[PDB]
Amino acid sequence: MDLYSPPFVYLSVLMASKPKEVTTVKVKAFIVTLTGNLSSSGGIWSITAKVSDGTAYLDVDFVDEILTSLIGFSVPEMKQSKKDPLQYQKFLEGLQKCQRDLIDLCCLMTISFNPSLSKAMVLALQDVNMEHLENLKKRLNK
Amino acid sequence: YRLWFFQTYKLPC
Amino acid sequence: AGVRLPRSPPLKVLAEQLRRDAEGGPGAWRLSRAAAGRGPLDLAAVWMQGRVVMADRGEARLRDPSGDFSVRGLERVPRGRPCLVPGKYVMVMGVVQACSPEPCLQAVKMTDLSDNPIHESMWELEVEDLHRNIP
């Protein structure tokens, strides 16, 4: 099994391939646990987690862009919202939506795997579609 | 077992 | 915070696979792959999916395409979109407590998959595909 085989590959297969360099793969995964709080340090959002695809556990960080899109607010927008109660109330709403979305997250994750640090960055999230179903049928020779 | 999602979750092992 | 997880990953399985292929006992569950001519898989943690057909405090019974399974301890797991009512399609991460007459899990997470029906279309194929790629 190829690391480019659609619709997704497996972490256990990635690790067994013993990659020397940082490697992009797409896996279907959920968050087993978060491993830190949401952080805005550095001027950007980050949060660490352990995900599983059913074949392995993987420490990951999520990119700012993903967390901005779940919350509805960038770090600058969050800071600006502290300047006005009505806007800050909207950020709190966005934060609850994000917390919930991380709890329920189960999707295709494009991840950048650093084999030296045994961890990865999640670059993008994608929901499954009928093409994914068709690719899985084709891979199972059906 | 223990998970964290903005609070701790204790589960039986 | 300082978290603690099952030693092994949540393997994807179907109810019938537990019900009929599991052996060993509490705390030493293993799944037979004698049919596919391969060695036992270790079975603490699982990833299972189904339609909720019964909900009662923190227990649920769920139906996947192969059969029913139970889940205990849902009052303890993270609450996303509420989905512990009949009709919801959900995933469960759990630990295997019994395999027959009816598979039973201790719940670690349960999360809603209802808002995209394509999860349900894919699930049985996912189980099969994952099983093919474990040596």
Which partners does chain B have (≥3 C-beta pairs < 8 Å)? A, C
Q: Measured between CB atoms, does C2 come within 8 Å of chain B?
A: yes
The answer as to whether A39 is a domain residue is yes
B11 contacts on A by Cβ (under 8 Å): none
Q: Cβ(A15)–Cβ(A56) under 8 Å?
A: yes
Check C78 against B8: CB less than 8 A apart.
Answer: no
CA pair distance C108, C77, nearest whole angstrom:
6
- Angstrom CA distances, C25 to C28, C99, C100, C104, C118, stand at 5, 9, 11, 13, 35
Tokens of A99: 């917390």
Q: For tokens 């190829």, what's the residue?
A: A2
In angstroms, the separation between the Cα of residue B13 and the nearest Cα of chain A is: 15
Resolution in angstroms comes to 2.3
Q: Measured between CB atoms, does C127 come within 8 Å of chain B?
A: no
Number of domains in chain A: 1
Strand locations in A56-118 (E): 57-62, 106-114
- Helix ranges, C3-117 (H): 15-21
Q: Cβ(C80)–Cβ(C73) under 8 Å?
A: no
Q: Cβ(C124)–Cβ(C14) under 8 Å?
A: yes
State which residue of chain A sits closest to C114, comparing Cα positions.
A104
In angstroms, the separation between the Cα of residue B4 and the nearest Cα of chain A is: 5
The answer as to whether A5 is a domain residue is no
C75 contacts on B by Cβ (under 8 Å): none
User: What b/e string do you get for A17-45 counting C-beta neighbours within 10 Å, with b at 16 or more?
Assistant: eeeeeeeebbbbbbbbbbbeebebeeeeb
Which partners does chain A have (≥3 C-beta pairs < 8 Å)? B, C
Q: For tokens 């999360």, what's the residue?
A: C111
Integer distance in angstroms from the first to the last C-alpha of chain C? 34
DSSP 8-state assignment for residue A39 = B
Instruction: Tell me which method was used to determine the 3D structure.
Output: X-ray
The answer as to whether A131 is a domain residue is no
Q: Which CATH class is domain C11-117?
A: mainly beta
Residue A45: give the domain boundaries. Answer: 11-126
C112 contacts on A by Cβ (under 8 Å): 104
Residue A94 belongs to a domain with what CATH number?
A: 2.40.50.510
